[PDB]
């Protein structure tokens, strides 16, 4: 069958926090894109420069699947040309992105009464990420003129914030699982093909 | 430091019944009470938290109630797979404490044991000891008397028994009994019998073999 | 999948010391609170302690009865958490679990557990088992059904695992709880029931592993003509 392992990305038991977003490299396989675009589960499925149907007749050097959790009102930030805490400080797509962004509501799994504080995002950073950059550092953010010597305190912020997802949140504040598929064509044989 | 108690110690019920188990905290914990289910050989599985909220994927036949010090877990439509020990846990503060558990057993119709006997292997006999094994397979209820007879002498002090937990699908048990004697003593006698008494058997069943035939 | 893989079970000496390790995969390990929970034979779970996530880096809390003797730590770069046990009384014998906090708070319950490892605290030496066949014969008449198994005898400490045909055979298996013999060594049997007509053409092998002594035995159980 040589079937590309999209099942292990999309049906993974848990997804990463967005500041520590996961990347899976997909290679040397036949990619059944029909199970994706025919899925009735996704609330977001937006492609840039390809179409899921006319991926079944294309080959790429590699395919990257990046996955993470954010809240619903941030899903729009997973798009080229966006601003916001997620696009600026957590996960950044390039202006000329080729790929697909897929997302679905995971309130049933990832929220808890009283709050699930296990999902985090970077709220403070000195500059914006470059496209496809990952920052997992936890240095104290100096927000004022007094230096902080890395402690946490007034004007000296821990850079990551918990989402605290609750199932009664409005949908804008419920958790969404996101997968981003990037399609890489290099001067190298192309090993990921549709059927 | 908060002490948790549970009641009853154990209970038996039939498939389809509703079962109720209780938990009490030694001080007010508001509604910070979780319930776990623990099946044989397995880690506890979280069923309910903040006293009445289901964990993902947990069937709605599980429900919890209560606030303050007294809490109640209700299982409606009891299934064979629900055989387990149930524990409560306060989760209001740091030394997280657990109750002593309630065992839930499944009542079902009588099923008589299949009875099998195994003489010692020649490989074991080479080593100076003989183990004779009697197996009672897939029966209900768990109480069965197992006697060892060697040339019709009732054996005493030289056998040990073990029983499985209730089967998660058919709610039966199995039982093994092992008679251990020296090779010298084994070779002195001829008839080895395992006799089984059980509610499913109209009269006791003896399975036997003659050493060397 | 979310996996918590535990290490460190087996025999440890009172007045020795022992580290249990919990290796995580499938989620952002550093964002979770890690608890250690233990369960002595026949009793309910007892929380041992935990270590909080990156928002309170490295901070810990303990049950009063282990404070000072046990130390919880974590290495987020390796995705491991540990329990360093330096006291070790015989009372510490128990199955130990690592587990994730469901909410990531100090008001927490545990929705993801490792499989548990048995720690046996005893002044004693390990002993691997002998494995003997329980061969099927006419004295396993039932119907067109035969019983056969293996006797796993004279080992210490618990536990032993048994599989059949390398895990391919699972239906009809019963592995019994071990019994402690008067010698102070354990013994266990594992049986399986199969169709009679399979005994001539299907080989049955019990795969026994006693990790505390690194004893691995594969025993063919052949039919007797009795
Ligand atoms: C993610 O899983 C869903 C769930 O379907 C089941 O679970 C899977 C782990 C696998 O064992 C499937 O065969 C199961 O059906 C998948 O959705 C199903 O996809 C199949 C196509 O193989 C389709 O016939 C079913 O109608 C789908 N069922 C539902 C409820 O949507 C899904 O395709 C998996 N995702 C990927 C990317 O593989």
Residue numbers in the entry:
A (entry chain A): 333 to 527
B (entry chain L): 1 to 213
C (entry chain H): 1 to 226
Q: Which text from the study accompanies this structure?
A:
More importantly, we isolated some extremely potent bnAbs (21B6, 27A12, 25F9 and 20A7) after the primary vaccination with an AS03-adjuvanted nanoparticle immunogen. Furthermore, we determined crystal structures of mAbs (25F9, 20A7, and 21B6) and their mode of binding to the RBD of SARS-CoV-2, as well as one structure of 21B6 complexed with the RBD of SARS-CoV-2 BA.2, at resolutions of 3.05, 2.58, 1.75 and 2.30 Å, respectively.
21B6 neutralizes a broad range of SARS-CoV-2 variants, including BA.2 and BA.5, with high potency, but does not neutralize other SARS-like viruses SARS-CoV and SHC014. The R346T mutation in the most recent circulating Omicron subvariants BQ.1.1 and XBB.1.5 would cause a loss of salt bridge with 21B6-VH D101, which may contribute to some loss of neutralization. 25F9, 20A7, 21B6, and 27A12 neutralized authentic SARS-CoV-2 BA.1 with IC50 values of 42 ng/ml, 6 ng/ml, 11 ng/ml, 5 ng/ml, respectively. Five bnAbs (25F9, 20A7, 21B6, 27A12, 27E3) stood out for their little neutralization changes across the SARS-CoV-2 variants.
